[PDB]
Amino acid sequence: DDEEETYRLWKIRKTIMQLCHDRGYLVTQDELDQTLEEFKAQFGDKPSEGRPRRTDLTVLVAHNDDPTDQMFVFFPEEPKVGIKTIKVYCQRMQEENITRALIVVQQGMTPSAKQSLVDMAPKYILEQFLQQELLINITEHELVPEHVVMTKEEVTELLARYKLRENQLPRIQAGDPVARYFGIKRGQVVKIIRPSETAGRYITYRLVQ
């Protein structure tokens, strides 16, 4: 029906707020814990021909360390995202000189849209997320351990202590769901803290290739 779509939109917003928080962006506690009833009351309820048109759901966040870069999570209405919508999104980003962005597709993006999304890679990093992938926080799963994005100083210390070339570390594909969750590019190292029935804790580090 349509309350299913509102439940989906609320859960997507919850997961995206957790995703923005985990990357270190400034999100309020209420944004992280907002009930479905509260979301309907604030955003009108019924999405079809209603107050939430899947626009105005976009969330702008700023990083704790420097409030200049920010990050704008979009919400396209077209089930098949095309060149035009990502183009207008990039224009809006530029007018506010914001750098990183997400695009929460409904079903998928056209191949030309994907090529254009990877085209402006150093200028404006825009990532793509299917709506289905955002209905659960994969990091909240019991099998998924705690991933922490290591800084360059920490990675330098890591390779100094163990005397490792960066390619001797275990790897993790950039398209892995957790790596995509933290938006890790090639080169960064992710610290993985997991419990063990033989040691208690084993901190691994995986390099993104």
Partner 1 sequence: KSMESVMVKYDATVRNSINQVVQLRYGEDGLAGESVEFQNLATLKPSNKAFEKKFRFDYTNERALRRTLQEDLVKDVLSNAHIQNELEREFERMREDREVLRVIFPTGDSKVVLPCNLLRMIWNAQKIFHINPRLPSDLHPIKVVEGVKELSKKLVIVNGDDPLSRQAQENATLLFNIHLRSTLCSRRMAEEFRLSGEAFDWLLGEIESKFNQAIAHPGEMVGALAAQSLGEPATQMTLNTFAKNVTLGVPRLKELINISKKPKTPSLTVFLLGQSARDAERAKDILCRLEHTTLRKVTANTAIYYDPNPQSTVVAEDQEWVNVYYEMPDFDVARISPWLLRVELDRKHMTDRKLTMEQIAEKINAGFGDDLNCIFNDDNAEKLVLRIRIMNSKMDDDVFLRCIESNMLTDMTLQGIEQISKVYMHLPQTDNKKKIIITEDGEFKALQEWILETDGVSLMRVLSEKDVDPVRTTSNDIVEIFTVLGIEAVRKALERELYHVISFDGSYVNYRHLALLCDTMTCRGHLMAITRHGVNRQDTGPLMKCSFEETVDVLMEA
Nearest to 15 by CA among 39, 41, 33, 37: 33
Minimum distance between the CB of residue 201 and partner 1, rounded to whole angstroms?
Answer: 4
Q: Which of 80/141 has CB closer to partner 1?
A: 141
Q: Which of 66/142 has CB closer to partner 1?
A: 142
Question: From CA 202, how far away is CA 204, in angstroms rounded?
Answer: 6
All residues at 6 or more sequence positions from 180 whose CB lies less than 8 Å from its CB, including other chains: 127, 129, 174
Q: Which of 12/71 has CB closer to partner 1?
A: 12
Question: From CA 10, how far away is CA 4, in angstroms rounded?
Answer: 10
Minimum distance between the CB of residue 208 and partner 1, rounded to whole angstroms?
Answer: 8
For the four alpha carbons of 13, 21, 123 and 209, in that order, the dihedral sign comes to negative
Q: Which of 68/132 has CB closer to partner 1?
A: 132
Minimum distance between the CB of residue 188 and partner 1, rounded to whole angstroms?
Answer: 13
Question: From CA 76, how far away is CA 136, in angstroms rounded?
Answer: 19
Q: Which of 88/136 has CB closer to partner 1?
A: 136
Whether residue 101 contacts residue 86, with contact meaning beta carbons closer than 8 Å, is answered with no
Q: Which of 26/135 has CB closer to partner 1?
A: 135
Minimum distance between the CB of residue 187 and partner 1, rounded to whole angstroms?
Answer: 14
User: Which residue ranges make up the site for partner 1 (CB under 8 A)?
Assistant: 7, 11, 132-133, 135-138, 140-145, 147, 157-158, 161-164, 167-173, 176-179, 192, 194-204, 206, 209
Whether residue 181 contacts residue 22, with contact meaning beta carbons closer than 8 Å, is answered with yes
Minimum distance between the CB of residue 13 and partner 1, rounded to whole angstroms?
Answer: 14
Nearest to 149 by CA among 177, 179, 190, 181: 190
Minimum distance between the CB of residue 181 and partner 1, rounded to whole angstroms?
Answer: 8
Angle at 8 between CA 62 and CA 180, to 5 degrees: 50
